[PDB]
């Protein structure tokens, strides 16, 4: 279960690495509609303090997440700047979060009568009174309850079905190294001359096999010229060789 429209779920993902490849094999084809950064460059171009919002709205308002488009939820529940960075991931929930009798736990607020600033959560429990008349009550004439309930019947058509969407936005707040991890693993010891990088030691040479004994706290090897000659691969624990071309 995800949080509703009026109070979106807050989760500040930080202190991790960069890996978003789990979305492709999670589900069949779905909507991405990425605008700021190209979708093929998410693994690289790391950011800091990703602002993640998770919530479910019907399919009518899924495509209204683009900046510059207003509406009923896109204007009064979640407002985006025109220079927005990042993009959302949306997918259907026809079998998981959709109740056969209609899920009514999801509620949304439409009456706020105020344009929202970007990136905040507002709570409006009070009831709005119209006609300049003191209402001070619930369910009366010229008084409207802002909260209204969703319906998740599976017999509904496309657009009225539940749609899980998670908003991902990337910002550089002076760019500290918080969430930035590549992988770039390639096990190839072919005894041919190669531009090798092991744990950040740039060099070119022919990688062969040796049997030198290294202490666990003793990684790099030197020589008389103070050059790296025998190294140890980071992923595994094997001393490669002392072999130039």
């Amino acid at each position, epitope marked *: 279960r995800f949080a509703s429209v009026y109070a979106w779920n807050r989760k500040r993902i930080s202190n991790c690495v960069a890996d978003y490849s789990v979305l492709y094999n999670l589900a069949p084809f779905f909507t991405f509609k990425c605008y700021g950064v190209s979708p093929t460059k998410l693994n690289d171009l790391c950011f800091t303090n990703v602002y993640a919002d998770s919530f479910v709205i019907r399919g009518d308002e899924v495509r209204q997440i683009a900046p510059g488009q*207003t509406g009923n939820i896109a204007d009064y529940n979640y407002k985006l700047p025109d220079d927005f960075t990042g993009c959302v991931i949306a997918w259907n929930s026809n079998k998981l979060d959709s109740k056969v009798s209609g899920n009514y736990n999801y509620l949304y607020r439409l009456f706020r009568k*105020s344009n929202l600033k970007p990136f905040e959560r507002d709570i409006s429990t009070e009831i709005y009174q119209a006609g300049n008349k003191p209402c001070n009550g619930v369910a009366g004439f010229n008084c409207y309850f802002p909260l209204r309930s969703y319906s998740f019947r599976p017999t509904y058509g496309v657009g009225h079905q539940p749609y899980r969407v998670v908003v991902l936005s990337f910002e550089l707040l002076h760019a500290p190294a918080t969430v930035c991890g590549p992988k770039k693993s390639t096990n190839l010891v072919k005894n041919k001359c190669v531009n090798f990088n092991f744990n950040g030691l740039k060099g070119t040479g022919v990688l062969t096999e040796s049997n030198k004994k290294f202490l666990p706290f003793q990684q790099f090897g030197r020589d008389i010229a103070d050059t790296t000659d025998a190294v140890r691969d980071p992923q595994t624990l094997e001393i490669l060789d002392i072999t130039p071309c």
Partner: antibody, heavy 118, light 107 residues
Framework: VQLVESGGGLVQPGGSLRLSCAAS????????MSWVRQGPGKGLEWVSV???????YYADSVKARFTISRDNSKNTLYLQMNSLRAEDTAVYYC?????????????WGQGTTVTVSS | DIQMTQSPSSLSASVGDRVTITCQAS??????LNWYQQKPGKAPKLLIY???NLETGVPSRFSGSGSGTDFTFTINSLQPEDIATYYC?????????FGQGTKVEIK
């Protein structure tokens, strides 16, 4: 809760005036209303819709023709027309959105019919 | 854009008898679909909310149901004071669209 017509008159093409729907206590600045179009013998048409946040939505046939003003406390909504090519021979209804998800308001409003000819 | 048309254009032969009016939508519609009841030259008056809710005081013989790009409305009491025109309108799907016309008349 009632509504008051304001407008009317016969004008040539190329001329326009201010059409007004006045409220009877309802605040007309920060609320959601709309204007729709009706002709004798033909179906309904939708002129425009205004929200509390300033969101103006209207049909593409009346693009760049209508501008709408909301009073702070005079309880009256104004509209000025532009580029009259004699297709406004109709009556306007000033109304409120019927229901978001659950409502039982049933109050409506009147308006004037205008004909445009040489 | 929603293009919607209805077969019962002129129900002028109904005098207190079974009435089967309907509206069909080009795309699939949810429950949210309503009607306007207006006299010729008069502002419409609401009678149906969200395809299932009714007014405060109206005759209770009215019935209706809508699912799968179609709403059906049936009335059995043809009272003389409610001679007017019935129109369909759909919301929550921008842009808003309105019906082309239904005629009901009692002899």
């Amino acid at each position: 809760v009632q509504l008051v017509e304001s407008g009317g008159g016969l004008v040539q093409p190329g001329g326009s005036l201010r059409l007004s729907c006045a409220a009877s206590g309802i605040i007309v600045s920060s609320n959601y209303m709309s204007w729709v179009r009706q002709g004798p013998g033909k179906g309904l048409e939708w002129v425009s819709v205004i929200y509390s946040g300033g969101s103006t939505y209207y049909a593409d046939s009346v693009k760049a023709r209508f501008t709408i003003s909301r009073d702070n406390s005079k309880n009256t909504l104004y509209l000025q027309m532009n580029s009259l090519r004699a297709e406004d021979t109709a009556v306007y209804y000033c109304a409120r959105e019927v229901v978001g998800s659950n409502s039982n308001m049933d109050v409506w409003g009147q308006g004037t019919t205008v004909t445009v000819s040489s | 854009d929603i293009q919607m048309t209805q077969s019962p254009s002129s129900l002028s032969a109904s005098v207190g008898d079974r009435v089967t009016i309907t509206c069909q939508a080009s795309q699939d519609i949810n429950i949210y679909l309503n009607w306007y009841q207006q006299k010729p030259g008069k502002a419409p008056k609401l009678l149906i909310y969200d395809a299932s809710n009714l007014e405060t005081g109206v005759p209770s013989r009215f019935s209706g149901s809508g699912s799968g790009t179609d709403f059906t409305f049936t009335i059995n009491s043809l009272q003389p004071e409610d001679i007017a025109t019935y129109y369909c309108q759909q919301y929550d799907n921008l842009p808003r669209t309105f019906g082309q016309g239904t005629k009901v008349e009692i002899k």
